[PDB]
Amino acid sequence: TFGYVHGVSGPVVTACDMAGAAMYELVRVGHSELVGEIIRLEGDMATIQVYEETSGVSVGDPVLRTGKPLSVELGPGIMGAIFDGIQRPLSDISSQTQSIYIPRGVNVSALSRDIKWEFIPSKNLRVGSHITGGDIYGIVNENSLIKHKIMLPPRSRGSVTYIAPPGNYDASDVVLELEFEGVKEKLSMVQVWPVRQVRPVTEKLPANHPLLTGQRVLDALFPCVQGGTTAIPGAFGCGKTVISQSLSKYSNSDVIIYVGCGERGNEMSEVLRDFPELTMEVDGKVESIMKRTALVANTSNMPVAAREASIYTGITLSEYFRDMGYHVSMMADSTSRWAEALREISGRLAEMPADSGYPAYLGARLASFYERAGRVKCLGNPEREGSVSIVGAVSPPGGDFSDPVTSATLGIVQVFWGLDKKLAQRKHFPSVNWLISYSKYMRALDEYYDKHFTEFVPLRTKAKEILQEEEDLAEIVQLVGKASLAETDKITLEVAKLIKDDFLQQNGYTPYDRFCPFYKTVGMLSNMISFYDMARRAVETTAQSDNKITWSIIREHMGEILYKLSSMKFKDPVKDGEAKIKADYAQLLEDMQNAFRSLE
Amino acid sequence: TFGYVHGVSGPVVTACDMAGAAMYELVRVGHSELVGEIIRLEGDMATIQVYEETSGVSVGDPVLRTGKPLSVELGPGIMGAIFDGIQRPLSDISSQTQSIYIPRGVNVSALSRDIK
Amino acid sequence: QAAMGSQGNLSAEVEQATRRQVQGMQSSQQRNRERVLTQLLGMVCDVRPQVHPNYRI
Amino acid sequence: GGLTSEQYHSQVVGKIGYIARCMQTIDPENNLKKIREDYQDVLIWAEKNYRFEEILEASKSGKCPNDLDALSRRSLILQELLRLVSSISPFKMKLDLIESQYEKMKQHVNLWKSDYHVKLNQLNQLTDYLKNAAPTPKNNFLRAMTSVLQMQIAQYGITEDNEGINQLFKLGLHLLAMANE
Amino acid sequence: YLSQPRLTYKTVSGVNGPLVILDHVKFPRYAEIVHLTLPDGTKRSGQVLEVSGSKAVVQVFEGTSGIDAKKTSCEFTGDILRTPVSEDMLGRVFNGSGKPIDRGPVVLAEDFLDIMGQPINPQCRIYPEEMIQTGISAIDGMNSIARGQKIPIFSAAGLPHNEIAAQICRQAGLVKKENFAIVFAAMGVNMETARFFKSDFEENGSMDNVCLFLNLANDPTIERIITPRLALTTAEFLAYQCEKHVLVILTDMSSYAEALREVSAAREEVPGRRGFPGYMYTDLATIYERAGRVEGRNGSITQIPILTMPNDDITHPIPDLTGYITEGQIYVDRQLHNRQIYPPINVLPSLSRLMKSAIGEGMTRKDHADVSNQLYACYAIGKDVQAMKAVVGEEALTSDDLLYLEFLQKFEKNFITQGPYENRTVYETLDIGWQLLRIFPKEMLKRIPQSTLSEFYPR
Amino acid sequence: YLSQPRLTYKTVSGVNGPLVILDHVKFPRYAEIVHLTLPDGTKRSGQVLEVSGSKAVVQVFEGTSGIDAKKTSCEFTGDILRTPVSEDMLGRVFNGSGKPIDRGPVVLAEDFLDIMGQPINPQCRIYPEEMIQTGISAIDGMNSIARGQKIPIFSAAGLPHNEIAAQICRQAGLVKKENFAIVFAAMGVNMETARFFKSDFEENGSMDNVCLFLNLANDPTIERIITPRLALTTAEFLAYQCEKHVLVILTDMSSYAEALREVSAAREEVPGRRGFPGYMYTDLATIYERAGRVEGRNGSITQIPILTMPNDDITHPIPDLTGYITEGQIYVDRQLHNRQIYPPINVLPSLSRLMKSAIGEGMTRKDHADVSNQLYACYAIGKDVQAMKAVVGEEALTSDDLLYLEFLQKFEKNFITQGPYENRTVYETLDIGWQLLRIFPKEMLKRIPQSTLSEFYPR
Amino acid sequence: EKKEKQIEQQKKIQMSNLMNQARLKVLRARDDLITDLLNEAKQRLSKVVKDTTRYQVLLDGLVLQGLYQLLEPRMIVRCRKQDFPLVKAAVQKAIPMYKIATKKDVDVQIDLEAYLPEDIAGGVEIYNGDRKIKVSNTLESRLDLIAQQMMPEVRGALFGANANRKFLD
């Protein structure tokens, strides 16, 4: 039952008399009972990463053994809650202790057992029916947005013997009863799942539907998909947290988990201040997105070993809401912090390091974490389809992507939104570096683009060609000057500047560009690309004439049109309706065509 | 006369009871007598660099001791010969085993004794 | 509409092929079942205890 | 199969049970002869009572249908048909129409991509909102339009190209999305 | 309270670097404090970094020189390092280890607060939305500080970072158009800097309201590890228990990170980049994250760490990790100090994450964000023009590039450059920003929306 | 055969990452196999990495999570890892460890083969000289593959090495002046890639002649140490005993090398470059060197590993050692991929060492060697001229330089660029190369003998 | 035309799927026949256990083989309660032979307090003194250890040799 602490060296602790304690079993270290997890097991001594500050633990302290791995209580009462790394609710801790701190070893439950939830059993289930893991035996009206489908746990099966009538039940109440091989199992609304084991799915379908962000450079040039893995490597101040928070605020994902892994503490309070006031319209009724956001916060100064627990708990909650049939999205605010936690634990263990001190298994950890992301055909009988998108920000030390963490993460992920400190400095936000960033879903998505936003595929192709041409011209211009440029090359440069300043960069903290619908994005790109096409036509059809049209003549003639193309961004999707915005973009296209015809 | 295999780790065997063994002396490790060369000594335990795949060697296997260093036979028959790294005649191994494989611990005299 | 007969035909064809094979294998098994079992059981019942060769003294 | 073998076979028997439940719910009378004939090899294990362990052993030995791809596709067809017949609850369909819809679904390449599935999703948005909504003018109007739509689907089916149903879908969805005030 | 007689062990086993490896300790406690009487009566302190059975590795703060094996005696205090804290600490001078060096009495504690503090429950941490009017234009107009921010001054050896920090201290105040209690903690600083800051807070009448922790270059290296924690523990007592508004300054976090590197190298822990420990992010987070407001408590803690970028390289681990941890960085530029601009702040790499809500309508003015963004953009383009003119020369520049060069010149002259005793209100700074943006036609101010241009541009 | 009962030990002395150290083991055998019944009944397996007296270090394949001392029962098989091989392993999907995941039955062993293989006598290993027409012009025309060769595809994170490999698999066949059996060892590949390959082999209807060993990214990370050896054992069976022509595709030798590094770091061996084991050269050699042909047998093994070069660094130990071992490399280039050129194969850093004997008169065509040499030389000079243009502008370029840049553009556009489903025969590749060499006057085509210029150039 | 080509490729993929089902089904039938053969062997061993005399001669060897595989000074033989007299006789006859062959002293006890399940076909499981090392010599264990090795022979005998396997080397 009890081990005894034999040594302390940081987050790592060694315990006597731990005869048969399994690897990654969960233990309580100290009289305050700090939680911890066994990671090496030598002789009869276990080595434990303690998920709470061990300062004050002494040799001889008890190490109570709980025969269960690090697991989370999955059930109603998650949505809108903020959890610490090991799923203790920070709001419950604040209410209970009436203090502004997280006492070491506080044992408050992960889900409240006092709140009465409305339960409406699945109408078809009856005593005697056969039921299997993932089957939905009821629904909880948790809040307006999330109809919380109660499911049998994976690895639970048998014949029903009692299905609770519809009514109000607390999370500790027995809601279902089944029996298999004659052994009888009572199931409440809450299940417990080990965070290190993948929640099973019947199948993992291809990812084929875009995860619309509010950001133009993301939605258009480098799409991500529901069920897709993404990374956002960028030096400090490149705006990766802002990209993650905008993707959390405005996206087409039914549920969002923000896993606050080892980043600034004030940002979780930023989320808790913003999200309640941000609302989305459902059934013509405005609802706060906090009802569909959940937060896991392990800020930088809270115990290091708990960053790994934070990551795993976030992905497990996301997998739960994926099993419900939701299109969950998980934002790992920094996986480099989790990698540093692994490095520190490895150092305390005296393991041989991989590059830059990281453990040899860092790549495997990152791979097994990112691999839980695909769109899936969920378990159980009611055929359901969900997703767990992953957006893992990376904080490469020194702002270089040769960092081992970013190198591995780019070997694993399928979308890479590399950010540039030199754009962040100029305030070219979002700081996505459009030359190195990429998205390997641009083919899987064309099936959707070519029937919802038909023109967008050629628009994007030409936009990327324009930007690459301007990149090629940059070196020549820097070393030779603008004097040598051809007339079409001037137009390439200037329309590329137009796209950079007025299509790619998007100030996320303003009413007009906090959210940029895809219709607005494709319309904007259509206007700019159409200007590019007409400008090149005008220059090419008169370059052989004596009355040559030149970029200077276009610039002087079309100051109003260029400024209108630059002011397209300011359109406000909610103050100005979709109809007004599309009408205005079409009107600008008409103006551009009129002026070109009147110029040539 | 002989020692015993006390441990194994890739090509690096370790043999106990190698009291009087000499550095770089040749040893036959295992029941298939994989050639090996003593590269280190510690007390009466000698560490052996094994010249053949050790997968399958087990603790307690005899380690026979030959009092000569890694040596090459020199005489008639070298010209036109194709040798392994340690003077094993590949063509003669093939002609003897009638197979396309080198048997582990195959021991065929480097220079044929049957040619007049 | 005419080509759906392609599956309609080849499903039955491949089922027939599988049936022929699953009869051939069964026939061979019935021809050799007993004489394999006698060898297997004799080899089980033949124990022949031995010590590990590396044993000393 | 990406599942453990035990989990796979428990899923197989779960699917068999779910097919039985969906059939018993959509056709409590046993009138859908063609559908029941098609689903005989899975329905037998419920129309004849068995224990969960018996059906699991039979799945492991291969006596039951034990291919989750086939079972999932068949269960999805039956699930969508049940969803249709249930969302049309007050306006029960004709048996001939039900069987025609079932055949149309069966022949579809991938139901989750299906226009049929999208139409059912829209009808379910309407029905699920009205299951809770209070009697404000918007909700009374949605109740009326949704009842008309359910009646029209009860006569024409969602696998068809009925422009009346299409326009009513569009207009009712717009009424739903439009702000309450 | 501990009522038991503490044990004094003369059982030193080994001594190695800053570590005394005691043996036969009875129920050792990790992070416990030990008081070491050396052979000659000199007393030192140490923190138990590791316990293993009956062993205890005591990292001695003052260093292990002179430590005997059979003669050193180590009494175990039985408790983690606790600092006595009372409001009387305001107007005192303590050394790196919290011992008074002003010939006043040792602190008569109001409480004994753990030096390590505790993390504020992120659910009950309140977001900083109140702007400090530092008076510096380069900060207020473009890197506005919020009361509760961790916004270090990134600088280099020989630069004016001391002068900038002192100016921020003397003229910091809310934009309401209450005094800050200051907790200052210098690590490895020279006597010149210690005298500078002390004489500054005395030249002002502030010293009655200032607490100084001093760990000069000649003072022990390992004690710089606890000096920040003493200062921040006092700041937390004042802010979260006495409800003061506290401004905490931590001088030479570089001389802190080097002490951390020394300890980690002696422990032979896994190194990060350029030798620093692998957990430097976590440790600097434990320091910095002790800032910001709290729910239900009127106090706050505003940190302004000062760190010397080595070789002026912002990618060096100290500035890099401090940038990741903190809510910004005010960048002090040698290329401006050489031109004798004060404050030599380089807004372009400067940043302030909490500006986005510290500015706007209501607090300060509604053109603040637009002016800041457009000044950043115009400054960046001016730097680009300066870069290209060195290649192509003046004769090949267009009139727009000449506009950008004029903007850059007048911007460094009027906006950045400022008197060391000059307190520009946010409104004066924004009016200067507009006087500079008026150099350009409306169409080239592409950041500012027309609703703001047509209202503020013409004047 | 082994009659003696197996020994089961509840004697686990330690668990450390992927390892499980046992003690009191009776006469342990190196490389022995162990079956571990965990406390809950879950059965894993491991391979003894070393033995010391009574000790035995069992590297567990399925990971050590959940294992415990005092209750995990390790059953020693008494024999090294022998895999069951059968010809009907074709048309199956196995996981990394050779267990079915297609819901078919376990392999009914036609034989048992040690997965470490058996070294083929070099005297009787026939030299491959039959060109495989991969259909990709960038390979056939300049880096041709002989049937029996090892030729990795060096690539990097984000490139279409999977697409290139699949195209080779579905287009490869001998030049027509015989069909292949694919053995595909996926290691560390994400579900997207595994499904892509499986779906491609189903789409092209080839599945009856394909055998997949899928160790996905989420599968245990030590299992990929044996996955490639299992694949090569099956390929050797099919080739050197069933007389088939086997093409082996190893998907990520970088993932396999990281499995090696994980085992090495757990064992705490002396580490080599970049943390990899010192013996990585030999351990990659035992994987790559199982290609080729042998006397008497008509079957052969073609081998096409795929390498994700970290940071695109070819000097990284994985690609460096794999280049030392294998007979060439096909180098997929991020720059060409970015410029949207498929296949991105960069012909400068890629070579096939057996091309010289695979090509020529009576095999492909008389002009093949000359055309390949001249295309390579012209491309390299064009790259140098392009680098000049980027530095000193196009006005300094002579007519020769402009011809070289025209050739470079049209070479990447017409010869390298290729449809993924387009299989250019060797002759069409050669003519598409002649059309490009025609850009130059004969006097500049130095590497082509006059006797072939006069024959092929004028057409 | 692209629609028609895609339909032809759908025929390709669907026929590939059908052929894969056929192949895996015939393979599964073959494996089921193998399992039936092994179950028949299990039943036959359960019958051999009934003949006490031959069961005694078999137990003598099983027990002595366990003793040789362990080579401990103290060992504990676990058997079915039904077999206890026979196992006692086997141990009593094994001890002299063990001493003579191994020259080691030995103390062999029978685990009267903990028997094997009665479902077991037969045999004995011998533990070292502290029960941390086991050698299993139940008839099921022998049957499996032998059959998994003999599968190539069983395959060749039941289902004939492979024509394509031109070499055995």
DSSP per-residue codes, F350-388: -EETTHHHHSSTTTT-TTHHHHHHHHHHHHHHHHHHHHH
CB F16 within 8 A of CB F266: yes
Question: 3-class secondary structure for chain G?
Answer: CHHHHHHHHHHHHHHHHHHHHHHHHHHHHHHHHHHHHHHHHHHHHHHHHHCHHHHHHHHHHHHHHHHHHHCCCEEEEECEHHHHHHHHHHHHHHHHHHHHHHCCCCEEEECCCCCECCCCCCEEEEEECCCCEEEEEEHHHHHHHHHHHHHHHHHHHHHCCCCCCCCCC
Phi, psi of D33 (to 5 degrees): -65, -45
Phi, psi of D41 (to 5 degrees): -65, -15
Cα F303 vs. chain centroid, distance in angstroms?
6
List the structure tokens of F269: 């061996």
Which residues have CB under 8 Å from B96's CB, separation 6+?
Answer: B108
What pairing do the DSSP bridges indicate for beta strands F7-9 and E306-308? unpaired
d(CA A92, CA F284): 55
| Chain breaks in chain C following residues, C–N > 2.5 Å | none
Q: Tell the burial category of F276 from Cβ atoms under 10 Å away from its Cβ (0-12, 13-18, 19+).
A: buried
Q: How far apart are the first and last CA of chain C?
A: 84
Cα E135 vs. chain centroid, distance in angstroms?
19
d(CA G56, CA F167): 65
d(CA E119, CA E288): 11
List the structure tokens of A580: 């007004």
d(CA A263, CA C24): 67
- Residue F176 near chain C (CB below 8 Å): no
Residue type, A47: T
* 3-class DSSP state of A462: helix
Query: Inter-axis angle of helices A487-499 and A456-480, to 10 degrees?
Result: 120
What's the sign of the alpha-carbon dihedral G77, G80, G85, G90?
negative
Any known ligand binding at F459?
A: no
What pairing do the DSSP bridges indicate for beta strands E181-189 and E145-146? unpaired
Phi, psi of A504 (to 5 degrees): -85, -50
Alpha-helical runs (H) found in D27-136: 33-38, 40-47, 52-61, 68-87, 95-107, 115-130
What dihedral angle (degrees, nearest 10) is formed by the CA atoms of E133, E139, E144, E150? Answer: -100
Which residues have CB under 8 Å from E5's CB, separation 6+?
Answer: none
d(CA F93, CA B53): 31
- Number of Cβ within 10 Å of residue F404's Cβ equals 27
d(CA E305, CA E120): 20
What pairing do the DSSP bridges indicate for beta strands B25-29 and A438-439? unpaired
* 3-class DSSP state of E301: strand
Alpha-helical runs (H) found in E91-209: 137-140, 161-171, 191-203
Q: Tell the burial category of B1 from Cβ atoms under 10 Å away from its Cβ (0-12, 13-18, 19+).
A: exposed
CB A379 within 8 A of CB D11: yes
Give the CA distances from residue D110 to residues A325, D73, D104, D116, F264, in Å, rounded to whole numbers and listed in that order: 18, 9, 12, 10, 48
A20–F39 CB contact, under 8 Å? yes
* 3-class DSSP state of A545: coil
> Residue F408's closest CA among F431, F377, F429?
F377
List the structure tokens of E391: 């290649």
Vertex D76, ends D74 and D79: CA angle to 5°? 110
Give the CA distances from residue E144 to residues A217, A238, E393, E425, in Å, rounded to whole numbers and listed in that order: 28, 18, 36, 12
d(CA E83, CA E107): 9
DSSP F191-205: HHHHHHHHHHHHHTT
CB F369 within 8 A of CB F360: yes
Alpha-helical runs (H) found in F289-367: 317-325, 334-338, 355-358
Q: Tell whether omega for the bond before F18 is within 30 degrees of 0, i.e. cis.
A: no
Which residues have CB under 8 Å from A66's CB, separation 6+?
Answer: A25, A26, A27, A28
Cα F175 vs. chain centroid, distance in angstroms?
22
d(CA A324, CA A385): 8
> Residue E162's closest CA among E252, E271, E222?
E252
DSSP letter at F166 equals H
d(CA A151, CA A319): 13
Any known ligand binding at A506?
A: yes
- How many residues would you count in chain G? 169
F49–B94 CB contact, under 8 Å? no
Cα F309 vs. chain centroid, distance in angstroms?
13
* Neighboring chain G residues of F26 at a CB cutoff of 8 Å: 69-71, 133
Helices H / strands E in chain F, number of each:
13, 21
Alpha-helical runs (H) found in A155-239: 216-219
List the structure tokens of D145: 């339009």
d(CA A15, CA A2): 9
Whether B and C touch, i.e. at least 3 CB pairs below 8 A, reads as: yes
List the structure tokens of F191: 């579900």
Cα F430 vs. chain centroid, distance in angstroms?
26
Whether F and D touch, i.e. at least 3 CB pairs below 8 A, reads as: yes
Question: 3-class secondary structure for A60-100?
Answer: CCEEEEEEEECEEEECCCCCCCEECCCCCEHHHHHHHHCCC
CB F67 within 8 A of CB A22: yes
- How many residues would you count in chain D? 181
Class for the domain spanning E1-459? alpha beta
* 3-class DSSP state of F295: coil
F120–B90 CB contact, under 8 Å? no
Residue reference for tokens 């879903």: A441
Alpha-helical runs (H) found in A481-558: 487-499, 518-542, 551-557
List the structure tokens of D167: 């326009």
d(CA F36, CA F58): 10
A131–D22 CB contact, under 8 Å? no
d(CA F265, CA F275): 8
What's the sign of the alpha-carbon dihedral A476, A479, A484, A490?
positive
d(CA A388, CA E339): 54
d(CA A210, CA F335): 27
Residue reference for tokens 């279409």: F160
List the structure tokens of A445: 């998505």
d(CA A366, CA A375): 19
- Residue B58 near chain C (CB below 8 Å): yes
Which residues have CB under 8 Å from E141's CB, separation 6+?
Answer: E368, E371, E372, E375, E415, E426, E429, E430, E432, E433
Max CA pair span of chain G: 87
Q: Tell whether omega for the bond before F343 is within 30 degrees of 0, i.e. cis.
A: yes
Which residues have CB under 8 Å from G35's CB, separation 6+?
Answer: none
F288: part of which helix (H) or strand (E)? Answer: helix F280-288
G65–F6 CB contact, under 8 Å? no
Residue type, A572: D
> Residue A341's closest CA among A321, A357, A364?
A357
d(CA F458, CA F435): 10
Which residues have CB under 8 Å from E117's CB, separation 6+?
Answer: E229, E232, E233, E236, E286, E290
- Number of Cβ within 10 Å of residue A42's Cβ equals 15
Mind telling me how many Å the CA of C36 is from chain G's nearest CA?
7
CB E152 within 8 A of CB E253: yes
E84: part of which helix (H) or strand (E)? Answer: strand E82-85
Give the CA distances from residue E286 to residues A263, A265, E119, E189, E229, in Å, rounded to whole numbers and listed in that order: 12, 11, 8, 22, 9
Vertex E218, ends E216 and E222: CA angle to 5°? 80
d(CA F367, CA F433): 11
Question: 3-class secondary structure for D18-55?
Answer: HHHHHHHHHCCCCCCHHHHHHCHHHHHHHHCCCCHHHH
Give the CA distances from residue D15 to residues A153, A273, A382, D66, in Å, rounded to whole numbers and listed in that order: 16, 45, 9, 10
CB B62 within 8 A of CB B2: yes
> Residue E250's closest CA among E311, E338, E161?
E161
Residue type, A342: L
Specify which residues B45 forms β-bridges with. B42
Vertex F132, ends F130 and F133: CA angle to 5°? 130
CB C33 within 8 A of CB G159: no
d(CA F12, CA A47): 16
- Taking CA–CA distances from B61, the nearest residue in chain C reads C54
d(CA F104, CA F106): 7
- Taking CA–CA distances from B99, the nearest residue in chain G reads G169
CB B106 within 8 A of CB B89: no
Phi, psi of E448 (to 5 degrees): -70, 130
Other chains touching B, judged by 3 or more CB pairs under 8 Å = C, F, G
C-G C-beta contacts closer than 8 Å: 93
D178–A284 CB contact, under 8 Å? yes
d(CA B44, CA B76): 40
CB A94 within 8 A of CB A100: yes
d(CA A253, CA A272): 19
- Residue B82 near chain F (CB below 8 Å): yes
A-F C-beta contacts closer than 8 Å: 127
Residue reference for tokens 């004029």: E406
Q: Tell the burial category of F202 from Cβ atoms under 10 Å away from its Cβ (0-12, 13-18, 19+).
A: middle
Q: How many CA atoms lie within 13 A of E428 on its CB side?
A: 17
G164–F243 CB contact, under 8 Å? yes
CB C10 within 8 A of CB G15: yes
Vertex E308, ends E304 and E310: CA angle to 5°? 150
E30–A57 CB contact, under 8 Å? yes
> Residue A497's closest CA among A533, A523, A528, A476?
A528
Vertex F419, ends F414 and F423: CA angle to 5°? 95
Alpha-helical runs (H) found in A324-387: 335-349, 362-370
Extended strands (E) in F260-333: 292-293, 300-308, 328-331
* Neighboring chain C residues of F105 at a CB cutoff of 8 Å: none
Q: Tell the burial category of E75 from Cβ atoms under 10 Å away from its Cβ (0-12, 13-18, 19+).
A: middle
What's the sign of the alpha-carbon dihedral F88, F89, F93, F95?
positive
Phi, psi of E164 (to 5 degrees): -65, -45
Mind telling me how many Å the CA of C27 is from chain G's nearest CA?
9
d(CA F332, CA F341): 10
> Residue F228's closest CA among F240, F217, F214?
F214
Residues 82-141 of D with CB under 8 A from A: 112, 129, 133, 138
- Number of Cβ within 10 Å of residue A74's Cβ equals 23
d(CA G162, CA G156): 8
d(CA G134, CA A283): 67
d(CA G166, CA E440): 87
Whether A and F touch, i.e. at least 3 CB pairs below 8 A, reads as: yes
Phi, psi of A584 (to 5 degrees): -65, -40
Residue type, F39: P
- Number of Cβ within 10 Å of residue A47's Cβ equals 24
CB E372 within 8 A of CB E296: no
* Neighboring chain F residues of C47 at a CB cutoff of 8 Å: 3
What's the sign of the alpha-carbon dihedral B3, B8, B14, B16?
negative
What dihedral angle (degrees, nearest 10) is formed by the CA atoms of D133, D139, D145, D147? Answer: 40
* 3-class DSSP state of F426: helix
| Chain breaks in chain F following residues, C–N > 2.5 Å | 177
CB F144 within 8 A of CB F352: yes
DSSP letter at F406 equals H
Q: Supply the Cα-derived Rg of chain E in whole angstroms.
A: 25
d(CA A365, CA A384): 29
F217–A371 CB contact, under 8 Å? yes
d(CA E91, CA E244): 14
Q: How far apart are the first and last CA of chain D?
A: 51
State which approach was used to obtain the coordinates: cryo-EM
